[PDB]
């Protein structure tokens, strides 16, 4: 088997292969995540001849935890499958289900081991993992190709994620949090910054307290498009 050192330090102390993996994230579709009290939400950027279902970038990992990603879609699918395996394997070892921190720590640990083990280039993805814990607290974390992880109130990754995070930093108030409708509107506003003409080109899903994941179809999405643009005038 192949024992070559793939990821190594440079003259100036950079892990170039991890840095090039983060360039592969910045080309991928703009994924955005937002937290609330009762609800947690994810949304993604977007051809006429495709099945939307197959190229879905929002994926459930267990009954309580799901995730979004941005970057290389093949690399994403392996991390998602191995996350899904670890979620059930966690229940098999200690009965109680997975907290959002534990699965994020695992995905981070998996990403980090590919930046340091021989033969293997890093995973060219950043993820946005969301859900509800044992006690029922809502969570949103973010991993990246290096295998660092941090909790967030809201965050963006992908194309123009600076301009989305700049928008989120301002707009994330206590007013937008309180209701289920208002948190969803905030995600669509944020995606409308980067999405050149929104509506139809926005994937979007939600998670509530005890309930499982729920993707909103383009009919449900275009309802909230009307509720945003009317309120701007007033």
């Amino acid at each position: 088997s192949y024992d070559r050192a793939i990821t190594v330090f440079s003259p100036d102390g950079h892990l170039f292969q991890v840095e090039y993996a983060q360039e592969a994230v910045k080309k991928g579709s703009t994924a955005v995540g937002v937290r609330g009290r009762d609800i947690v939400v994810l949304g993604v950027e977007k051809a006429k001849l495709q099945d939307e279902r197959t190229v879905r970038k929002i994926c459930a990992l267990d009954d309580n935890v799901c995730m979004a990603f941005a970057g290389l879609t093949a690399d994403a699918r392996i991390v998602i499958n191995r996350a899904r395996v670890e979620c059930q394997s966690h229940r098999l070892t200690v009965e109680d289900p997975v907290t959002v921190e534990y699965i994020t720590r695992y995905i981070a640990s998996l990403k980090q081991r590919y930046t340091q083990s021989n033969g293997r280039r890093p995973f060219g993805i950043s993820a946005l993992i969301v859900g509800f814990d044992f006690d029922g607290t809502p969570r949103l974390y973010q991993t990246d190709p290096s295998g660092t992880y941090h909790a967030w109130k809201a965050n963006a990754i992908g194309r123009g994620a600076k301009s989305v995070r700049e928008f989120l930093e301002k707009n994330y108030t206590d007013e937008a949090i309180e209701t289920d409708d208002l948190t969803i509107k905030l995600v669509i506003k944020a995606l409308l910054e980067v999405v050149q003409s929104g509506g139809k080109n926005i994937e979007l899903a939600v998670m509530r307290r005890d309930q499982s994941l729920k993707i909103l179809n383009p009919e449900e999405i275009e309802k909230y498009v009307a509720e945003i643009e009317k309120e701007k005038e007033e």
């Binding site: 070559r4 050192a5 440079s10 295998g147």
Partner: protein
């Protein structure tokens, strides 16, 4: 292009050389050893108010009598922190006792040059860990603070810092440090020396402090406890 286990003409490994260069990019951390306790302080370096401040654990509990502060590649550190945590409880299992601060630091120091290409196991390392660790605890030989770098070199320190302003902070530690001082003087010394080098102006959400005394266990400071110390 060359191998990971290649010496320079100066007589040192390029990847170890470049692992020391990686710590300069990392955010600064200070630890001061005193007779009354070892304090440990670190800047979080928060890039956004959306980012939750409490989920940047740059000081962590190794055991009830030991802590460890880190600078550099944050992901690389978590492998070494877990191995230390495993080592202490493996020692508790076998020997029914606590490890020394030296013994823990040595165990982590054994992993530093465990990298290479040919002749290796499935999960074995390609490169070194680009992480400096400031261990700090209280064992049978009083309160002890220990430094470690990517080479594996580890040594006891009366006071030391690591990171971007390691050079700048060590000059401030030389003047400020006195060997017969108290713990509370040493705590406030660190936050003075941290406030200068950051220039985000220092606050309870922007930093982590933590201490270990002989009587008291490892304690990481809260918002209220940090807000009391903040500035005098």
């Amino acid at each position: 292009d060359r191998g990971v286990n290649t010496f320079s003409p100066e007589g040192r490994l390029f990847q170890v050389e470049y692992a020391i260069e990686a710590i300069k990019l990392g955010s600064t951390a200070i630890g001061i050893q005193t007779s009354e306790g070892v304090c440990l302080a670190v800047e979080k370096r928060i890039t956004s108010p959306l980012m939750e401040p409490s989920s940047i654990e740059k000081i962590v509990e190794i055991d009830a009598h030991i802590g460890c502060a880190m600078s550099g590649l944050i992901a690389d550190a978590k492998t070494l922190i877990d191995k230390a945590r495993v080592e202490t409880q493996n020692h508790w299992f076998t020997y029914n006792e606590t490890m020394t601060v030296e013994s823990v630091t040595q165990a982590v120091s054994n992993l530093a040059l465990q990298f290479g290409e040919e002749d290796a196991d499935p999960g074995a390392m390609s490169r070194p860990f680009g992480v400096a660790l400031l261990f700090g605890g209280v064992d049978e030989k009083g309160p002890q603070l220990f430094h470690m770098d990517p080479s594996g070199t580890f040594v006891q320190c009366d006071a030391r810092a690591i990171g971007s302003a390691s050079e700048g902070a060590q000059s401030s530690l030389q003047e400020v440090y006195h060997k017969s001082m108290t713990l509370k003087e040493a705590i406030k010394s660190s936050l003075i020396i941290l406030k200068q080098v950051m220039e985000e102006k220092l606050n309870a959400t922007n930093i982590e402090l933590a201490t270990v005394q002989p009587g008291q266990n490892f304690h990481m400071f809260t918002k209220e406890e940090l807000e009391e110390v903040i500035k005098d």
